[PDB]
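During the second year of the project, the team shifted from modelling isolated chains to modelling whole assemblies. The rationale, set out in the original proposal, was that interfaces cannot be judged from single-chain predictions alone. As a representative example for this report, we include one of the complexes processed in the last quarter. Its constituent sequences, exactly as entered into the pipeline, are reproduced here:
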Amino acid sequence: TLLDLSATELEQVLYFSKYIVLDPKGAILNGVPVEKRQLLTDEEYRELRYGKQETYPLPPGVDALVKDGEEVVKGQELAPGVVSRLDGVALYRFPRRVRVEYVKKERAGLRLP
Amino acid sequence: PKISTSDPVRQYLHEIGQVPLLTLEEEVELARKVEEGMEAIKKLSEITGLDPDLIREVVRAKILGSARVRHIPGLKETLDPKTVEEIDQKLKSLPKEHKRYLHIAREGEAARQHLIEANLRLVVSIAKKYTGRGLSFLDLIQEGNQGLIRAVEKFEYKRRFKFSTYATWWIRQAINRAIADQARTIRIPVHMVETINKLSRTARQLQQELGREPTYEEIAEAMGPGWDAKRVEETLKIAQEPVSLETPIGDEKDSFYGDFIPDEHLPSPVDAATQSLLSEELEKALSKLSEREAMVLKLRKGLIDGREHTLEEVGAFFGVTRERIRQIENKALRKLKYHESRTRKLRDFLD
Amino acid sequence: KARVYPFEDDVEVSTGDRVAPGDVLADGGKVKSDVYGRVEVDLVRNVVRVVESYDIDARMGAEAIQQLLKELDLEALEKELLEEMKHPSRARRAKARKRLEVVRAFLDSGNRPEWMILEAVPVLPPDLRPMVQVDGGRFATSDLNDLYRRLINRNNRLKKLLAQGAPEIIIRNEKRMLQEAVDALLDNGRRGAPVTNPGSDRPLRSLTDILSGKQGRFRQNLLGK
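Output from the structure prediction step:
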């Protein structure tokens, strides 16, 4: 009654399924600055106060982008063929192959006719 | 608005499926951050001079403490106000080579949070087999969960044990000692549970090996060397539920078990009145007595302490002791005999 | 999705911190951060990642609720409803006028709408819930007495878990289990009652069952003293 919160509304806040807001300043995938009230779920919350993150797997093959293992634009291809549906930062994980290139310098002996 | 209510079980188990299993490499890598973070924490407390227990809070009060900084700081046992920053402000204001440890401490505590989450299904997978044994399925998962936390603290990644089958042990331990502690309306020692949990095992064999129900003599000679016949009876009286005052009695509708249980602690209208007419006659019996023919018996008996070997030692403020106090209750106790045998006031107050 | 920021020498704010806009992020106030988020501070490669994320006070539990009820102003909600009063008439008045009467009666007593939410749970004196010994070294007690134990282990186990600073998921499950618990004590049956584990499936006579004589007790009442 006193909180213009419904019957069912009151549940998801008192039995732990949907977060009621109090102080926000934010708008993601809504484009709407969500006001000082009303409920939202986990996979909604784990997006707002956590951010958008996505991990991706691979067989024992090759990277085909960890050289550019810094930045990515939506749908960009990497590896044999993986493509990530997110626009942000691509990042290394568990390296199995690392090439060490040994730059060396000497002094030669010559004798030309 | 009724689609589902008993979600607590299902609800959790679906929140629980949200977090995915770890690699034989991810498990490892996550653990390595925490041990270092734990060291880093010391390394900081070594340099700051602050306490390991404290730093660990002020570090958690950031990685978690977006709001986690408790609403009321333990009613001011804990401090969570302006104080938190000042500490993390000193930790930020370290020179770079000591400061680096903070960024290890943050990474570790963060890695801690993860290592728990990823293995929370393992708790469920174990606590399910432990269900019904006195305690709730959730109540078991919650206990086992902090068994899974305990596993995380007391653990070294260098010894490459398979963590799957490692925490498994800690987990059970937490559930077992939980069951033995909570699952009874009367708390009972942990070995006392195992005595009955040996009985419970032992009773089933003798139920089939003898055909009939075995006796108190039958059980000791099968339980262990130092077991008595009279004993079992006590370990069985002890074992029971017990009865609920809110049990209904035959009629089923109105009468409950408790309804028929009398009082005997409180004095009854007859008693109370007696245990006040006996008194109002004592101040009408030794009222015409000396304040030492009465007060000695009002220190021996009129003030409650035996005074068997407590009055002869202490000179009792102003008087005489030794071979005379063991005759002062002949000056006092044997004075009360005549005024009782002549005007027979006190004769009937016996029964 | 994270705005990366590289540093040359100095760096303030650690991983877990929350930033923006134009806030000093590195190098004696040279490298600042634009967007809101969680700081990462990459130990290996010198680049302080700021993960695209807000910081929202968006809570579950009666904690969140308890707040609102403090933050509520009656005086306001009375006159603000007095405007809602008789303007859509057959629609958003008929309900918005019922709502009002509560505010009035709340304002007529002197009760803060937060006292409805419990944080200090009182406990019935022990004698009227006794633990008496009967026959054969066996006892008898109330359901109330077993409804409290199950509550406490959960509040007590919460203090451990919160002290420990465990992951939120589990900090939750215990609060869910604590609402479920206080419920079943205050009024056990308004969500599918708990019973004395083995024994039978008899629901536990809760303070509610007790007062309104729910189980043939109000019929016993009028059978007099």
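Chain B touches chain C through 65 residues (CB under 8 Å). The beta strands of chain B are 243-244.
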